Amino acid sequence: KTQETVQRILLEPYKYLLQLPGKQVRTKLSQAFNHWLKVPEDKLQIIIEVTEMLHNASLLIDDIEDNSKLRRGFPVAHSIYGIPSVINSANYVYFLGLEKVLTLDHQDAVKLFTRQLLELHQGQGLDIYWRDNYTCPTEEEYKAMVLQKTGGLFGLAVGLMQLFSDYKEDLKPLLNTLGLFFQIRDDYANLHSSENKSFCEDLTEGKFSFPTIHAIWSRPESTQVQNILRQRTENIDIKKYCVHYLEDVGSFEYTRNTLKELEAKAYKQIDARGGNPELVALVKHLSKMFKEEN
Amino acid sequence: QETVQRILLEPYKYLLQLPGKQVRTKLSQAFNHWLKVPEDKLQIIIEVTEMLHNASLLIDDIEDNSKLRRGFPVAHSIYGIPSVINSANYVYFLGLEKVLTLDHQDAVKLFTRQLLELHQGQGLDIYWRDNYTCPTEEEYKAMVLQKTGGLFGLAVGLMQLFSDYKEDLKPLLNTLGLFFQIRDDYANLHSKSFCEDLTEGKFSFPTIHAIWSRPESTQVQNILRQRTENIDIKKYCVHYLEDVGSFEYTRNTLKELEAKAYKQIDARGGNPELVALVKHLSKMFKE
Amino acid sequence: QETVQRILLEPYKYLLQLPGKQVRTKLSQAFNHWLKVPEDKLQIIIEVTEMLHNASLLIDDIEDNSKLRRGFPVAHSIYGIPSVINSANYVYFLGLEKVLTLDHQDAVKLFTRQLLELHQGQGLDIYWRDNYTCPTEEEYKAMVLQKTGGLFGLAVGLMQLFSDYKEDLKPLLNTLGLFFQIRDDYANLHSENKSFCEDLTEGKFSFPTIHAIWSRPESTQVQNILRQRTENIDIKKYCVHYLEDVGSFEYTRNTLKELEAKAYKQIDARGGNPELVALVKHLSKMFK
Amino acid sequence: TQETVQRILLEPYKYLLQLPGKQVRTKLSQAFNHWLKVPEDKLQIIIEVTEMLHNASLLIDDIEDNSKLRRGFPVAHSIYGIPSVINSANYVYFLGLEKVLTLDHQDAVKLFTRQLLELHQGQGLDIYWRDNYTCPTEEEYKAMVLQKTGGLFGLAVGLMQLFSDYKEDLKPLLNTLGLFFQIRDDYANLHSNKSFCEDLTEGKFSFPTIHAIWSRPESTQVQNILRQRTENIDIKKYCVHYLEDVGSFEYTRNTLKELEAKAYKQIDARGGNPELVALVKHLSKMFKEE
Amino acid sequence: TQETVQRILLEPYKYLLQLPGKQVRTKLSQAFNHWLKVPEDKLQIIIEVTEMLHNASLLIDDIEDNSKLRRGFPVAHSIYGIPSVINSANYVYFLGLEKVLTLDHQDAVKLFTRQLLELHQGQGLDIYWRDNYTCPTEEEYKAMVLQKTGGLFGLAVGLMQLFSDYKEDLKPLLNTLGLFFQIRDDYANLHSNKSFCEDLTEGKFSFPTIHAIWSRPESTQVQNILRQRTENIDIKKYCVHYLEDVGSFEYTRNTLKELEAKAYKQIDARGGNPELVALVKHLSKMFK
Amino acid sequence: QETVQRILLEPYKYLLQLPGKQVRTKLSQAFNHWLKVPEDKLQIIIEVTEMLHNASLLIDDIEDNSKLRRGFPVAHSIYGIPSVINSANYVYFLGLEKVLTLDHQDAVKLFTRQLLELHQGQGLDIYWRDNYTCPTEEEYKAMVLQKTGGLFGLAVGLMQLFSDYKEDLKPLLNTLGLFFQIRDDYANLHNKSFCEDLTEGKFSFPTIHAIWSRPESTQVQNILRQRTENIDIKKYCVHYLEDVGSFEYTRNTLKELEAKAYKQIDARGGNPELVALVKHLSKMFK
Ligand SMILES: CCCCCN(C)CCC(O)(P(=O)(O)O)P(=O)(O)O
Ligand SMILES: CCCCCN(C)CCC(O)(P(=O)(O)O)P(=O)(O)O
Ligand SMILES: CCCCCN(C)CCC(O)(P(=O)(O)O)P(=O)(O)O
Ligand SMILES: CCCCCN(C)CCC(O)(P(=O)(O)O)P(=O)(O)O
Ligand SMILES: CCCCCN(C)CCC(O)(P(=O)(O)O)P(=O)(O)O
Ligand SMILES: CCCCCN(C)CCC(O)(P(=O)(O)O)P(=O)(O)O
Ligand SMILES: [Mg+2]
Ligand SMILES: [Mg+2]
Ligand SMILES: [Mg+2]
Ligand SMILES: [Mg+2]
Ligand SMILES: [Mg+2]
Ligand SMILES: [Mg+2]
Ligand SMILES: [Mg+2]
Ligand SMILES: [Mg+2]
Ligand SMILES: [Mg+2]
Ligand SMILES: [Mg+2]
Ligand SMILES: [Mg+2]
Ligand SMILES: [Mg+2]
Ligand SMILES: [Mg+2]
Ligand SMILES: [Mg+2]
Ligand SMILES: [Mg+2]
Ligand SMILES: [Mg+2]
Ligand SMILES: [Mg+2]
């Protein structure tokens, strides 16, 4: 059993990332959705653990794929332990999550786990494909990818909960709204505001995110943003210049407007389902970020 | 229009061009001499095995900074590291999806256990290499059983779920796992490109012997730490390995493993296909 | 002062050490079969043309990260990129200066028109490569007519200023421009001039790789290899094997054989030209 | 793809036009037009030619000098790439040549050719010395500055003079203004466009560093620091301290104060020019205090 | 001509003489001369030898450690280049040997040789552990520090004692002061004249990081951060936060206060020394 | 303990595997034909000489960014620059320690003088290369006399402290020093990999000739400034050197030095071993 220290070696990058929980929005979202689903506490606890394990593991992988520098205000794990250690450690946690999903003792849990992880990797693969092949998505293509990349894990937690629930109404349209809302909110924070990532890391990554997609499509006579993204640059002045352009062509105002529409849509969709005070409060809390800047 | 799936799989499809499936086919057939798996289950198991193995190679080439595999560029040198990580991980879960089609209550548990063991072996190999702590020979062997036994044990274990043959194949699987890996360490330095294991910096069976058997020198550790592509440094380090007897020691370890495999195969009633495969693979360390 | 000019010209004189085929002069001599330009004007026109040609090669090797030209190291790998840019651009305007000595009211306007054409072709070639958008075959050919036909048209157009010859040479110049560039795309990947498949390291879309990309749209292997900007010999050999396997080299050879045949028909349409015929035939040994 | 091809080829050029600096060029045109009284149609073309050639030359210069910022903006090639900007700048050179033809003057191209050859001779000497590690004497530097800056200076004024009845010799004044503008640019760069002392990162021999090198020949630290091509702020701060301590900044201020006085003398010798005097005075605040 | 040769060879050395820290060595010379009362002619030579050897060893040490700043100035090799600074420092070593001979004492050269061998054994262990990724124990670290600092400490004092009537054993005090100076450095480097946490960029095992490594053996965080040899400010800030949280800075302050108290006790055992006490007291403001 | 000593000396011990001890012993033996040094003193002097020479090569390989020496990887390419600097410098002072055991009043003073001369030559060589000022041919030779005479004069000078042979060997040591260095300059472009001198960017005898004899070209200066490993640039510059006659000029200089060596040896009563050694070394350019 002592030889099992190997477990400590393999998990150290994972435990490092856990040194500072970001939010437990997926945990708090699970609790909010249990207002409808009324899942027995023992099953719910396992589902939350699986969900957060996969979430944190995917952040380890995502930061490697994106050449990110900070997460949750801390250096990314692979910048300390190295990329090879963190790939293996994150992937190890994927299969520890599969192991935990088996303890739910439901014939369909693994099938749902599989379905959602395939969707997550399709979303992530599209995000990477567009960025690294320098082909900006349309706004609609971006949204559809976000539903897979971000809604994927939402749908895993909620889908697993429904396996143990008598509530059989379709929650997928609301999950879709929350997935888009969460990602665009994150796209906005990364370029408009440190607290999570360092200064405009999305620009250094070269990713097409909601603000830059708007700037690219709404001013087609300029290729400035595409070229800056292609430079994969860390230069603070180029990044500051590109943020000024996004501001001047209304990309940040357009992103705030989209977020305000998504928040309003969430409230309507929650009201159509009989209400949910916990979910309303969570959406409202997440929406302070794009409302009072001055 | 669902051209997405081809984009996500292209690094995987690229790797399928590479030599190496035949030996995996012969291993399936050789073990089927005992297990006599029904063709429909056997076909699914081979597909699962091929997906997981190849996906793990895509990842391993990134973890090891390799340039060539079986004479082909590594996939991430064409498609990029971010694309290949995601594509390899996608295939892991397509492999999980396929094992579900086996329609056996224990297939997923065995899949999970074996993938966990594969990652424990890989993690130790990476930890030692990148934290500059050379393992003992016993630690290396224990790690190899995890690193190689993972998919070895998955393929055979899945076959046994559908077999009346219930004898213990694990000791033989252990011998073959050590045999394959040490033979691979030996081939790498004794003639991927020229001595790529030295560029990777990994502690392999020959360098582990040289490090421990000549403790007054830090030559090998320092060369591995350089992570160098320099051919003269590599040629220098191979000559040292030769002079302190590391290649002779590895050949002898391999000859013991070959003999043990034959002993264990006979203890299981014989297996002409496996004997011929072991004998053929053992020409690599013979003059 | 004379020593200032030697300092400024040293990268240019360095490149001139290399023995070029001077095909543009031989083409000038062949086209003079029709145009019959007095030798004094012709010598000036030839000098302008080779000056601009060699200066544009200095710039092109910088824009393309090339390592060898005509079997010698590129000038900027010896003297540095800043020195070679200024020296090459210096020669552009020395070419303008010599163009003035032709003492013809229309010489400068033609010089200007053709260099605007050269930079539009070159700019498109650079734009596609560095923005990772592969051109269609038709788009590629049209830019080649500007990039490579541009300088052909400068030499012949200047000659026509001093000629009574009234036939239209533009269709033949277009064929020779396409023929020369595709022949060069082919040599770079199939065959000294450049090092091993430098076009793949540059990441440019050339006739063979354009064919492989469009004719096998379900694979993105070539686009990705070009995007890597790699010097790895094994990746390059792999990419050449693919081009061969999907018929890209056979397709390029057939395109070249059609272009050679078209040149002969167009030369016959202008009364014949033994010198130009022999030159096209000589250049066509590169394939077959 | 119809007119959008031109937009693609011209985008690095259009990007640079966002940058402050045209106002001073406008004020220079207006100041010299006080004497030259150029008809508006010819003047408008000449200003267009000058803005094209000047900006195209800055695009090339930032590549040649490995600059990162110009007038607080990213250099064009750090956004669009070096290959794109080279071709785009050179394209603009010949669009400038095309525009020069519309002046319909037999001598316009001869002047264009002469002045662009001068520009490239100055630039080549500036690059040659820097990248071959041979520091010029002050006199060699000044002669190079007359070519490097006089090139477009003399083109603007020379083209204007082709359409003017004012035929007095402006070259001595253009030479003074050329030295004045460049040395003021060397001084501002190290004394505080570019980020912190970018000239040191470029490694160029500028007026202050030339003085320090020649006036303290028993030390080679400045040559060695320039050779480092460094972005290290501490090395740059150290080298500024050395220049200060050996009096190179005081020497540069004195040279600039002499040039300002000479400009006024040469302007008075040409009958006066309140606009040019006011521009020189405003530009000369850069090397003063009180 | 030779005059200029000497200036060429000595310029990296003369550059370093601009840097602060001359005063501390002067204050140490005078404080120990309170006991040793060295004849002025010998003392001046010894001070010169001490300054030559110390500065030369700092020139070399900055190359070995990839440092950027020393005492707020750029390291010499960042201006003149590593090859120039190596040769210049080594030249000064033997100019220091040449000057030691002018002491005209049979044992001066024997003491010089012994102490420089001492210094290089300390330096070699410091470099060996760092670059072979083997963290020393606290005891091993202290023993290495006694050699690295005792090298020049013992040379200066040993040479002074050759010409002195004071024959008491100063080695125990030199050992304490050597530990005091190095650990006070280790502390200043990470807790505040180098730029921000250069020791982390160097990857060296210093007193605070040695404590963190051994006191939390289930973590490899510090070893991995040191292995990165990073200039990333956020990683450095993270590693300083970690050191604080596991008590490494508190532990270092404790060692420093024990060393300070021991120095005072050892100084009093040697008859007192107001100058040395005041210097130790001033240096001890850095903690508590 | 003693394992510290092994740690500190490992880069030095690595270099001892390399060839070239043979030539140095042959040089010691040839000069002992005149000097007839007592065996106990001779052994210490040989030991001192090998320590200082090998330590100086460790340092030189760092200063010169070399890849190979005598067909082996340079020590710092295995152990790292920091380890090799300290180990080489450690051996310098172990060499001083061993010199003390000669028990001669003038030994350390001679040791000091010669080590200062070595560093003056080395420093000038480095100064010219890294400040991009090519020496004149005469400046180069004077620098070579310091760089090589340092250890030549140390070995021979220490021997003479214990010798009745008191004739002036310095003019001969000067010629042999030039012969050795210029021959190595010649071999490098005509041990190390392909033209490592060009990668180092140093001014050596062939490139100095090419630079001064064709002053209208800066091609060689620029190639050296690139500090390049590109084989095509190296091949280009060697062919340039051939075409402007630098290799023939270097060969002629070497044969003049060989002939002068023979005359200077005969002026000292003859020395069959030294003549035979010079003759063998002259096969390289004949
Ligand atoms: C590896 C599986 C992908 C899962 C991705 N998660 C949504 C997190 C990634 C992000 O949200 P993050 O901003 O990096 O945290 P992204 O903006 O890159 O989409
Ligand atoms: C991610 C899991 C990878 C499993 C790796 N297999 C052992 C094969 C890889 C090797 O055998 P290979 O020689 O690289 O193919 P390695 O020497 O790296 O261990
Ligand atoms: C600056 C204008 C560029 C002119 C370059 N010539 C057209 C042809 C140059 C080429 O053929 P080359 O093979 O590099 O000589 P490219 O295919 O790169 O364009
Ligand atoms: C290619 C022609 C470039 C002409 C350059 N002008 C002198 C202005 C450029 C400068 O003043 P700038 O400071 O870069 O704007 P430089 O210091 O480089 O000389
Ligand atoms: C006090 C006498 C010892 C001489 C100093 N050593 C050479 C090293 C200098 C150091 O203290 P420094 O902080 O770099 O100056 P190091 O940390 O590298 O050990
Ligand atoms: C400090 C080292 C001084 C000793 C150097 N010797 C001349 C031999 C070194 C050489 O001959 P080598 O060819 O590198 O061995 P170099 O050309 O560099 O001078
Ligand atoms: Mg991300
Ligand atoms: Mg991402
Ligand atoms: Mg591997
Ligand atoms: Mg591996
Ligand atoms: Mg292997
Ligand atoms: Mg080209
Ligand atoms: Mg090109
Ligand atoms: Mg071409
Ligand atoms: Mg500039
Ligand atoms: Mg400039
Ligand atoms: Mg300037
Ligand atoms: Mg230090
Ligand atoms: Mg140190
Ligand atoms: Mg320190
Ligand atoms: Mg050398
Ligand atoms: Mg040398
Ligand atoms: Mg040499």
Nearest to D274 by CA among D21, D26, D35: D35
C220/C204 Cα distance (integer angstroms): 15
Radius of gyration over every alpha carbon of chain D, rounded to an integer in angstroms: 20
**B90 near C CB under 8 A:** no
Q: What is the number of other CB atoms lying within 10 angstroms of the CB of residue E185?
A: 16
Q: Cβ separation of D78 and A231 shorter than 8 Å?
A: yes
Residue B152 neighbours by CB under 8 Å, 6+ apart: B173, B176, B177
Q: How far apart are CA F267 and CA C84, in angstroms?
A: 57
**Which has the closest alpha carbon to F237: F177, F194, F281?**
F194
Q: Return the SS3 of E164.
A: coil
What would you report as the CA-atom Rg of chain F, rounded to the nearest whole angstrom? 19
The CA-based angle D277-D282-D283, given to 5 degrees, is: 100
The helix (H) or strand (E) run that includes residue F109 is: helix F107-130
Write out the two tokens for E77: 């090799």
CA E125 from chain centre, in angstroms, equals: 14
Query: Phi and psi of D19, rounded to 5°?
Result: -85, 140
DSSP string, D72-135: TEE-THHHH-HHHHHHHHHHHHHHHHHHHHTT--TTHHHHHHHHHHHHHHHHHHHHHHHHHT-P
C-alpha distances out from residue E249 to D80, E201, F12, Å: 49, 18, 38
Q: Residue A88 and residue A191: Cα distance in Å, rounded?
A: 30
Supply φ then ψ for residue E233, to 5 degrees: -65, -35
How far apart CA B104 and CA B157 sit, in angstroms, is: 12
Q: Residue D87 has which token pair?
A: 């071709």
Contacts of D223 in chain F (CB under 8 A): 131
Contacts of C102 (CB under 8 A, 6+ apart): C41, C44, C45, C158, C161
* Dihedral sign for Cα atoms in the order B242, B244, B249, B250: negative
CA dist F129 to B206, F187, F225, F226, Å? 43, 19, 9, 12
Contact predicate D83/C126, CB 8 Å: yes
* In contact, A81 and E226? CB cutoff 8 Å: no
The pairing of strands B72-73 and B68-69 is antiparallel
Rounded to whole angstroms, what are the CA distances from F150 to F115, F119, F158, F160? 6, 8, 12, 15
The amino acid occupying position A55 is H
CA-CA distance, E146 to E141, in Å (whole number)? 9
What does the alpha-carbon distance between residue E136 and residue E143 come to, in Å, rounded to a whole number?
Answer: 10
Q: Is the minimum distance from the CB of E61 to ligand 5 under 6 angstroms?
A: yes
Report the alpha-carbon distance of residue A118 to residue A112 in Å, rounded: 10
Q: Does E11 touch chain D (CB under 8 A)?
A: yes
Cα–Cα distances in Å, from A200 out to A187, A236, A242, C159? 10, 9, 10, 57
CB E286 within 8 A of CB E187: yes
CA–CA separation, E31 and E272 (whole Å):
10
User: Cα-flanking dihedrals φ and ψ of residue D69, to 5°?
Assistant: -125, 150
Breaks (C-N over 2.5 A) in chain F follow: 190
Q: Report how far residue E238's alpha carbon sits from residue F236's, in angstroms, rounded to the nearest whole number.
A: 51
CA nearest E98: which of F113, F98, F153, F157?
F113
Measure Cα distances from C146 to C120, C141, C151, C204 in Å. Answer: 7, 9, 8, 17
Distance in Å, alpha carbon of C166 to nearest chain A alpha carbon: 43
How far does E255 lie from chain A, in Å, by closest CA?
29
Q: Which residues of A are less than 8 Å from E238 in CB distance?
A: 74-75
Q: Give the residue from D148, D144, D147, D149 showing the smallest Cα distance to D134.
A: D144
CATH placement of domain D1-290 = 1.10.600.10
Among residues A85, A109, A68, A108, the alpha carbon closest in space to that of A9 is found at: A85
CA E189 to ligand 20 center in whole angstroms: 6
Q: Which of B29, B84, B58 is nearest to B272 (CA)?
A: B29
Q: Residue A125: CB partners within 8 Å, gap ≥ 6? A: B4, B7, B8, B83, B86, B87, B90
A1-294: which CATH architecture?
Orthogonal Bundle (1.10)
Task: Spell A249-281 as b/e; 16+ CB within 10 A means b.
Answer: bbbbebbbebbeebbebbbebbeebeebeebee
Specify the CATH architecture of the domain E1-288: Orthogonal Bundle (1.10)
Give exposure, A182-217, as e/b (b: 16+ Cβ within 10 Å): bbbbbbbbbbbeeeebbbbbbbbbbbbbbbbbbbbe
Closest CA to B65 of A47, E190, A84: A84
Task: Indicate yes or no: CB of F77 within 8 angstroms of CB of B216.
Answer: no
Cβ-based contacts of D15 with chain A (< 8 Å): 224
Q: What would the two tokens of residue F196 be?
A: 């490592």
Q: Return the H-helix or E-strand segment holding F92.
A: helix F81-100
The tokens for C23 are 């095909």
Token pair listed for F190? 């005509």
Compute the distance between CA of residue D167 and CA of residue D82 in angstroms, rounded to an integer: 42
**Closest CA of chain F from D134, distance in Å:** 9
* Nearest of C286, C281, C273, C271 to residue C28 by alpha carbon: C273
Q: Which residues have a Cβ under 8 Å from the Cβ of D134 and sit 6 or more positions away?
A: D128
Residue C167 in 3-state DSSP?
coil
Complete DSSP assignment for D165-227:
S--S--HHHHHHHHHHHHHHHHHHHHH---STTHHHHHT---HHHHHHHHH-TT--HHHHHHH
3-state SS record for A96-158? HHHHHHHCCCCCCHHHHHHHHHHHHHHHHHHHHHHHHCCCCCCHHHHHHHHHHHCHHHHHHHH
Is the CA virtual torsion F53, F58, F61, F66 positive or negative? Answer: positive
Compute the half-sphere exposure of residue D176: CA atoms within 13 Å on the CB side of its CA.
17
Nearest to D94 among C82, C100, C116 (CB): C116
Closest-lying ligand to the alpha carbon of F18? 6
Spell out a b/e string for E48-71, using b for 16 or more CB atoms within 10 Å of the CB, else e: ebbbbbbbbbbbbbbbbbebbbbe
Supply C242's token pair.
């693919």
Total length of chain E: 288
CA angle B15, B17, B19 (to 5 degrees): 100
| Encoded amino acid at A224, one letter | Q
State the amino acid at position B185 in one-letter form.
D
Contact criterion met (CB < 8 Å) for F222 and D133: no
**Cβ atoms D29, D43 nearer than 8 A:** yes
Concatenating the DSSP letter of every residue in E239-285 gives HHHHHHHTTHHHHHHHHHHHHHHHHHHHHHHTT--HHHHHHHHHHGG
Q: Crossing angle of helices B231-243/B219-226, nearest 10°?
A: 150
In the reported structure, the alpha carbon of residue C228 is separated from the centroid of ligand 6 by a whole-number distance in angstroms of: 41
Resolution (A): 2.2
The Cα–Cα gap between A238 and D69 comes to 9
Measured between alpha carbons, how far is F9 from F98 in angstroms, rounded to an integer?
16
Instruction: For helices F3-15 and E108-131, give the axis angle rounded to 10 degrees.
Output: 80
Surface-to-core class of residue F215, CB atoms within 10 Å of its CB (0-12 exposed, 13-18 middle, 19+ buried): exposed
**Domain F1-286 class, CATH top level:** mainly alpha
What is the four-CA torsion angle of A286, A94, E230, E203, rounded to 10 degrees? Answer: 130
Q: What is d(CA D217, CA A212) in angstroms, rounded to the nearest whole number?
A: 54
CB D159 within 8 A of CB D49: yes
Q: How far apart are CA B41 and CA B164, in angstroms?
A: 14
Q: What is the rounded CA–CA span in Å between residue F165 and residue F175?
A: 20
Torsion sign, CA atoms E190, E194, E199, E203: positive
Could you tell me if the CB of F59 is within 6 A of ligand 6? Answer: yes
3-state SS class at F209: helix
Q: In angstroms, rounded to a whole number, what is the distance separating the alpha carbons of residues E205 and E136?
A: 7
**CA dihedral of F75, F79, F84, F87, whole degrees rounded to 10:** -110
Q: Which of A130, A134, A228 to mutate to test the interface with C (most CBs of C within 10 A)?
A: A134
Check if F29 contacts B (Cβ < 8 Å).
no
Per-residue CA distances from B192 to B71, B199, C229 (Å): 6, 11, 21
CB A146 within 8 A of CB B125: no
* Test mutation, E79, E193, E195, E231, chain D, max D CBs within 10 A: E79
Cα angle A263, A264, A268; round to 5:
120
Q: Which residues contact A189 (CB under 8 A, 6 or more apart)?
A: A196, A289
Q: Please tell me the distance from the alpha carbon of residue B15 to that of residue B11, in angstroms, as a whole number.
A: 6
Ligand 1 atom at shortest distance from the alpha carbon of A71 = 15
Which class is domain B1-287? mainly alpha
Amino acid identity for residue B277 in this structure: L
- Return the ∠ at Cα C158 (arms to C154 and C164), rounded to 5°: 135
Pairing of strands A74-75, A70-71: antiparallel
Q: Distance from C220 to chain B by nearest Cα, in Å?
A: 8
Can you tell me the distance from the alpha carbon of A122 to that of A57, in angstroms, rounded to the nearest whole number?
17
Mind spelling out the 3-state secondary structure of chain B?
Answer: CCCHHHHHHHHHHHHCCCCCHHHHHHHHHHHHHHHCCCHHHHHHHHHHHHHHHHHHHHHHHHHHCCCEECCEECCHHHHCHHHHHHHHHHHHHHHHHHHHCCCCCCHHHHHHHHHHHHHHHHHHHHHHHHCCCCCCHHHHHHHHHHHHHHHHHHHHHHHHHCCCCCCCCHHHHHHHHHHHHHHHHHHHHHCCCCCHHHHHCCCCHHHHHHHHHCCCCCHHHHHHHHCCCCHHHHHHHHHHHHHCCHHHHHHHHHHHHHHHHHHHHHHCCCCHHHHHHHHHHHHHHCC
Q: What are phi and psi of C69, to 5 degrees?
A: -135, 130
- Say if ligand 6 is within 6 A of residue F56 CB: yes
What are the structure tokens assigned to B227, written together?
Answer: 């992570």
d(CA C229, CA E186): 45
List Cβ neighbours of B263 (8 Å cut-off, separation of 6 or more): none
- Cβ–ligand 3 distance for C206 under 6 Å, the answer no
Report yes or no: F139 and E2 within 8 Å, Cβ to Cβ: no
Q: Which two tokens stand for residue D228?
A: 């480092």
